[PDB]
């Protein structure tokens, strides 16, 4: 048994880590330059090849997440501090011409306020939603945010139209890839091929559908941690998208107003004609066959004759209630109760929205931004890919499931996309035994 | 320059042939050739290209598994085969050439993977017609 | 406009294959370890670039200390312990992959390598000046 | 990957500019750093002959009418000085993806 | 001399490169805003001299500075005759003469390097 | 419950010895150029991104990759490369020292030699370089001759 080592090189061996990302490819998404490239990376599939995989584990999760919280504070510098807003307001209502269901948002109101000389004031009138402003004690009230942190603006060269990102990985690393369609969220994959840069990832923001996403291969599938616990928000992903419309039929104006010494503030004009409800329309048909398939995976992991049925939202706060997007760029809030509302046992639709000004963020109280009113009509088609589900308990004798709305933390957001990737750190150093011998 | 599109003729279905394009006044080896499809009062049509050293062929996508094409660079000839022939398959087909010179192919040092270049066209021929018919 | 001519190995295409057949593509590792690129982002591109030039020099050090420094692989004169693994030469050679065969062995690098650079120092270079006189 | 023309056609008299349009499906701004947008023209019973290459660069040999425009999300023309030899088909070209697509047809003539 | 070669014929400026070579054998030996840029350029010189040390490393040739190699010179690549090529062309004009077959030359030399040179060479190494 | 046992070398193992014998514990001593600390800084290796701090961390790395690359070339300017030890061509001047070699190889150490020999540096680097150079390449060009 006469025998040696060999010591080998560059021999294909995988290991785990974490690494830090790299971008690929007047807007502040990305950049006006982010990396140039051949941008055709190209996949390479492997042979007799297990791999294990897991979800909601993902480094590639958070590095995003603090990627665009680091580049939304890298918009936000070089504006303008709304510091002389925080003042006393005298009111009006709005009349003419109007429709009735649009009684009580707009607000016609005026105040004093500085000009860049530091030595006189003016009269500055415009106008407000009903959902931004607080009573004080005629209507004297006072600005939402005020007993809190300050406001800001937002430069108005600036939109917020949202562009595909490649992730790519540093070298001596490796980026993996599960080719089987199959793939709940956790368990091996048994066909992986490799690339080099990923696909095309729209950061799109919104509360409890998903839009402009990517589809399933096969069918609808149903994706959550653990189903037996009801403590778990529930990820859906369709296999054919559903249009929308949405759109502002109000035709708008906007001022412009020299506050400060290089300062000017962006205020409200009016309106020509009538004062309309901003609204959302979808199909009613597809809807119903969407449903139904939604059932008929849902079935094969529940009762099967246990009553599956819709309730509406639990209440709680107003962010997860309605429904945010960005169309246009600016929020709307939707007030979406009629889409919940189905029982189901073994072509219009119409839904108000509502828009904010002062919106918070991702989960701080410590900003404030403050968009200007964007003149004109808007319209925006979108499409419709993904739903976020709960679920309550008590399991008393198996009856009566009844689902709700949810996603509150973007996070799941971003495994919608991610649910498939994995990093790998690559050891190419590695030795064998054998009948060889060196040589004197 | 000088290209030829001969071959004219007239056929019932279920045939086999041979067609040819004669060149000249450029140094063939190094350019790709095209295969464009008129239909009588209709617009254009692309059917074939081959590559540019003759190793590399893409069809359209009604073809694809009936035709052939061939490139000679010694006598500097197009031969072109057609099969199993339709009357609805009646057009004017021509043989013309892209502008742009391409060059050798490019090696990718991640997993190889030969690749190559094309781009449209500039000269056109006079043509020629087929008429598939029944009698 | 394009057309593909695939001619070489894949990057790592060889990982599901049998050990002494897949021995022979070990040269696309090697040639795909420092290119890629053939505010913020710049900050971690260069990040990144020196991440890759820490563990290729550290790779580099660990060959040029042994006496297996530029030339792919080698020899020794380390005689096998059989405490580690006990097969009977076929079973590995013919029968095992390359992940197999780093879980198996996966605590006992650390010796392996002091004993290389052991035998390596020893009897190799002081022998050598003995050899360089008479 | 589909392509149409815009508008459909056009009688046109002398003494005026012209412009004629092409919309994409896609946006086509090729690794190389160009767009793959040809025009070339034929005339009735005659062959085609190339109008116009790299989006806006007119072709050797060509009076200086001919020109190029626009970019991935639309493309036109540009033509001043309208003669009655510019009469014909002009075919706007994808010269991207397989397979090639084409423009569909712009019948050019004079007024009566 | 440092780039002395420059306006010469290759087969002219045969000899003479290894005083070249002792020459090109330094750079590093003989030692805020404007930091950052010095380290970037810090960056770049060691990325490409350690670029040229694997592409030695990897081959054969990683010892001395011309060598010789088991690859038969295919004629798709050029077709002019050696007396021609050595008193007759300088050096950027062979480059624009061979800068598209690069990368297929590398990847045959890569192949030779592997094959029959060390596995071929641990067959040798039993008796 | 941790408890310790065999032992090796170990890091300096040898400062207070005898060169003869202290002559083999070089690897151990020099693998350690590029560490040290051979344990997560990954997670702060990435987050640093907006500071000075990691900026200077950067400038640390840096800096030791490139005194490696200023000792390993300048050795492989000498036709030593790749080498633990090597011999030469320059004969010893014995100007220098002429103590016997049974007092250097038995009864010195090394802080002792460098407090000794620290003037004569450069003239030793000059001549090194000196017949790498000279015949090393001009007799081998006449050694070229096949
Ligand atoms: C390598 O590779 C490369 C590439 O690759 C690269 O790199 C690599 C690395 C990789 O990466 C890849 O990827 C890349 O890509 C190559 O390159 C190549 O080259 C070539 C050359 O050979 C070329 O080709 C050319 O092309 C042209 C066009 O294009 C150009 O232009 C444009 C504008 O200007 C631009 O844009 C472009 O770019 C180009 O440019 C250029 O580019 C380049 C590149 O980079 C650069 O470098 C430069 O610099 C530039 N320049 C400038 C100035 O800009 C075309 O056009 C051409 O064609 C033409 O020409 C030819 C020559 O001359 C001709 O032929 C002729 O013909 C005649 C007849 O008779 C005869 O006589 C003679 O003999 C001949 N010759 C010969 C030689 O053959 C042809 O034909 C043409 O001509 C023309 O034709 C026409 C027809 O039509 C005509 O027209 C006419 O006219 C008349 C009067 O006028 C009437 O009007 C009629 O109607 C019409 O039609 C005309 O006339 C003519 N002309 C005259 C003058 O006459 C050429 O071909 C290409 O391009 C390239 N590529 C690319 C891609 O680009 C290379 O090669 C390789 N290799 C090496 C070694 O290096
Ligand atoms: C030096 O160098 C040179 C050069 O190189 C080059 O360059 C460089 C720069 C680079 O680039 C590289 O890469 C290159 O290569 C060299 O040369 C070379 O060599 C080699 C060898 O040595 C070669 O290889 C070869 O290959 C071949 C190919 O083949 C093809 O084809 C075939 C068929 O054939 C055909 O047939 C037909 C019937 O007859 C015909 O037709 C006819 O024709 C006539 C005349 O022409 C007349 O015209 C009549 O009319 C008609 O009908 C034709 O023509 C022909 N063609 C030809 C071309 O020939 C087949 O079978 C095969 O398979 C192939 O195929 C192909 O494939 C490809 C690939 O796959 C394909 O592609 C495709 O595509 C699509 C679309 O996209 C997709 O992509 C897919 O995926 C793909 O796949 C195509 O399509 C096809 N085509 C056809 C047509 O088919 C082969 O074959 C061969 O093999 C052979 O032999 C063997 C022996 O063992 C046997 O086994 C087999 O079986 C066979 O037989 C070979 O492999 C190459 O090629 C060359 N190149 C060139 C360019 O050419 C040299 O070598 C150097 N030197 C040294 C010393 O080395
Ligand atoms: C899911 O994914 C879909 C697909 O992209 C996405 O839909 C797209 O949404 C965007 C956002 O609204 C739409 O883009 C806008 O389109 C309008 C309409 O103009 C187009 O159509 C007219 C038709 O007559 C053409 O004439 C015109 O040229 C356009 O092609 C534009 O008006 C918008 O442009 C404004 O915004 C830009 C960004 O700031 C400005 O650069 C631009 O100049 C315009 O702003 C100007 O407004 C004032 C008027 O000129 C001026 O005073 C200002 O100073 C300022 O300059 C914008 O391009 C796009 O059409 C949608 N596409 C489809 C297919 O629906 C969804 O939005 C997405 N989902 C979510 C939630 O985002
Ligand atoms: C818009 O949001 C409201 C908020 O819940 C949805 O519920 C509707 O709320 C109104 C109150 O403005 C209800 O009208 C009356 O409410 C009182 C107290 O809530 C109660 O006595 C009765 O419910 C009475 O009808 C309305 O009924 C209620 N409707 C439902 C279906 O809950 C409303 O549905 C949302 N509309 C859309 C189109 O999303
Ligand atoms: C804006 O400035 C005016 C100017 O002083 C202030 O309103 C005055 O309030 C005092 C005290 O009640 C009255 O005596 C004056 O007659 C008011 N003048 C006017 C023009 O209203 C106050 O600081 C601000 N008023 C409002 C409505 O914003
Ligand atoms: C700052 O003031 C606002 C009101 O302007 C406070 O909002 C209160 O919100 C609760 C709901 O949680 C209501 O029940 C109260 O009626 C609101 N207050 C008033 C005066 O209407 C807000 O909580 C205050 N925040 C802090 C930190 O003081
Ligand atoms: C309502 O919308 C129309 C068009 O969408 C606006 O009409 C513009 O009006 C200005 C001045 O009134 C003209 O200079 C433009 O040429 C008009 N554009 C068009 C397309 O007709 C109108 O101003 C809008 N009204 C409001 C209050 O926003
Ligand atoms: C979701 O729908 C339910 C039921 O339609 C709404 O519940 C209302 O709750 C209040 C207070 O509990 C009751 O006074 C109302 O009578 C209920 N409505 C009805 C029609 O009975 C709930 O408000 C809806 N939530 C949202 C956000 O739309
Ligand atoms: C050893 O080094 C000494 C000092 O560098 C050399 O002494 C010099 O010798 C030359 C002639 O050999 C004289 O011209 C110099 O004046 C001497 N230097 C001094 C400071 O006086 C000595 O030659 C060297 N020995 C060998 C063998 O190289
Ligand atoms: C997907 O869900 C099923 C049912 O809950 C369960 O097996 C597991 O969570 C996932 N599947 C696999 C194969 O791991
Ligand atoms: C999670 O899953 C386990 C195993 O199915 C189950 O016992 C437990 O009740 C679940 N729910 C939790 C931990 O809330
Ligand atoms: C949305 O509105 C536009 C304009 O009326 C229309 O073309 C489109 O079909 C609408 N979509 C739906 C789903 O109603
Ligand atoms: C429910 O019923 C369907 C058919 O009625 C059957 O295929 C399925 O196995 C049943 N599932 C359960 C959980 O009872
Ligand atoms: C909600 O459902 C109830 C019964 O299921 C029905 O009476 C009511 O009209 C529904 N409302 C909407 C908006 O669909
Ligand atoms: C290895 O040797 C043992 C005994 O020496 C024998 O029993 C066994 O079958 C052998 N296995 C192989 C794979 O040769
Ligand atoms: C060799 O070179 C001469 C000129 O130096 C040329 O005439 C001859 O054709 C060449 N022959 C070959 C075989 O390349
Ligand atoms: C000095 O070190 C040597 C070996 O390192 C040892 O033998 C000797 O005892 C030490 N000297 C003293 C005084 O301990
Ligand atoms: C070296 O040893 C020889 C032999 O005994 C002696 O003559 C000489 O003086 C010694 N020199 C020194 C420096 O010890
Ligand atoms: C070193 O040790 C040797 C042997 O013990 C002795 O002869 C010599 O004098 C010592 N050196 C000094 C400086 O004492």
């Known amino acids: ?440 | 320059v000088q290209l030829v599109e001969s071959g004219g003729g007239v056929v019932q279905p279920g045939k086999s042939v041979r067609l040819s394009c004669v060149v000249s006044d450029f140094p063939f080896s190094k350019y790709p050739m095209y295969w464009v499809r008129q239909a009588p009062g209709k617009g254009l049509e692309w059917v074939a290209a081959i590559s540019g050293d003759a190793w590399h062929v893409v069809y359209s996508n009604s073809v694809q598994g009936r035709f052939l094409v061939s490139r000679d660079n010694v006598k500097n000839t197009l031969y072109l085969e057609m099969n199993s022939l339709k009357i609805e398959d009646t057009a004017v087909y021509r043989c013309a050439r892209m502008f742009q010179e391409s060059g050798p192919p490019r090696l990718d040092r991640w997993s190889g993977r030969n690749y190559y270049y094309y781009s449209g066209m500039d000269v056109w021929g006079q043509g020629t017609t087929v008429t598939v018919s029944s009698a | ?134 | 990957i589909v392509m149409t023309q815009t508008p459909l056609s056009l009688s046109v008299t002398p003494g005026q500019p012209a412009s004629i349009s092409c919309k994409s499906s896609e946006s086509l701004r090729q690794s190389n750093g160009k767009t793959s947008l040809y025009w070339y023209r034929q005339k009735p019973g005659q062959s085609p002959q190339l109008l116009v290459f790299e989006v806006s660069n007119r072709f050797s040999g060509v009076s200086d009418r001919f020109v190029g425009s626009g970019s991935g999300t639309d493309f036109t023309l540009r033509i001043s000085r309208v003669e009655a030899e510019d009469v014909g088909f002009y075919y706007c070209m994808q010269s991207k993806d397989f397979p090639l697509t084409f423009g569909g047809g712009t019948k050019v003539d004079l007024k009566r």
């Open chain 3, 1 to 134: 406009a394009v057309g593909i001519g695939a001619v070489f190995l894949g990057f790592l295409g060889a990982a599901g294959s049998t050990m002494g057949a897949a021995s022979m593509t070990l040269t696309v590792q090697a040639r795909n370890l420092l290119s890629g690129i053939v505010t913020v982002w710049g900050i971690k591109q260069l990040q990144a670039r020196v991440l890759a030039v820490e563990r290729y020099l550290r790779d580099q050090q660990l060959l040029g200390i042994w006496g297996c420094s530029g030339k792919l692989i080698c020899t020794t004169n380390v005689p096998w312990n059989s405490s580690w693994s006990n097969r009977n030469l076929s079973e590995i050679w013919d029968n095992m992959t390359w992940l197999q065969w780093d879980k198996e062995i996966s605590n006992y690098t650390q010796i392996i390598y002091g004993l290389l650079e052991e035998s390596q120092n020893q009897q190799e270079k002081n022998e050598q000046d003995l050899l360089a006189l008479d």
């Open chain 1, 1 to 440: 048994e006469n025998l040696w080592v060999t010591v080998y090189y560059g021999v294909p061996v995988w290991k785990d880590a974490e690494t830090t990302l790299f971008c690929a490819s007047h807007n502040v998404w990305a950049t006006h330059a982010c990396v140039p490239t051949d941008p055709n990376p190209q996949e390479i599939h492997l042979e007799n090849v297990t791999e294990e995989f897991n979800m909601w584990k993902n480094n590639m999760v958070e590095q995003m997440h603090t990627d665009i919280i680091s580049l939304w504070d890298q918009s936000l510098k070089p504006c303008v501090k709304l510091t002389p807003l925080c003042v006393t307001l005298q009111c009006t209502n709005v009349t003419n011409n109007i429709t009735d269901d649009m009684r009580g948002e707009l607000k016609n109101c005026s105040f004093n306020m500085t000009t860049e000389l530091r030595d006189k004031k003016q009269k500055v009138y415009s106008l407000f939603y009903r959902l931004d402003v607080v009573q004080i004690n005629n209507k004297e009230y006072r600005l939402i945010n005020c007993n809190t942190s300050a406001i800001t603006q937002a430069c108005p060269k600036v939109s917020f139209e949202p562009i595909p990102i490649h992730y790519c990985a540093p070298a001596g690393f490796a980026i993996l890839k599960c080719k089987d369609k199959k793939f709940n969220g956790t368990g091996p994959c048994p066909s992986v091929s490799t690339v080099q840069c990923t696909h095309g990832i729209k950061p799109v923001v919104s509360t409890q559908l998903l839009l402009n996403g990517s589809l399933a291969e096969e069918e609808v599938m149903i994706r959550s941690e653990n189903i037996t616990n009801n403590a778990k928000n529930i990820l859906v992903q369709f296999n054919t998208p559903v249009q929308i419309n949405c759109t502002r039929p109000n035709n708008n104006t906007r001022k412009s107003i020299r506050i400060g010494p290089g300062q000017a503030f962006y205020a409200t004009g009016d309106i020509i004609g009538d004062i309309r409800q901003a609204h959302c329309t979808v199909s009613k048909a597809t809807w119903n066959e969407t449903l139904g398939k939604v059932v008929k995976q849902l079935r094969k992991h529940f009762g099967n004759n246990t009553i599956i049925r819709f309730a509406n939202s639990s209440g709680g706060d107003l962010e997860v209630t309605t429904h945010s997007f960005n169309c246009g760029g600016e929020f709307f809030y939707c007030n979406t109760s009629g889409l919940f509302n189905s029982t189901w046992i073994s072509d219009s639709i119409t839904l108000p929205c509502r828009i904010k000004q002062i919106i918070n963020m991702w989960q701080r109280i410590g900003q404030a931004m403050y968009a200007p009113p964007i003149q004109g009509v808007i319209r925006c088609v979108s499409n419709i890919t993904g739903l976020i589900l709960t679920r309550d308990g008590g399991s008393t004798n198996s009856t009566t499931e009844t689902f709700r709305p949810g996603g509150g933390d973007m996070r799941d957001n971003w495994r919608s996309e991610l649910y498939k990737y994995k990093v790998v750190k690559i050891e190419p150093l590695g030795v064998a035994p054998t009948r060889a011998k060196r040589r004197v």
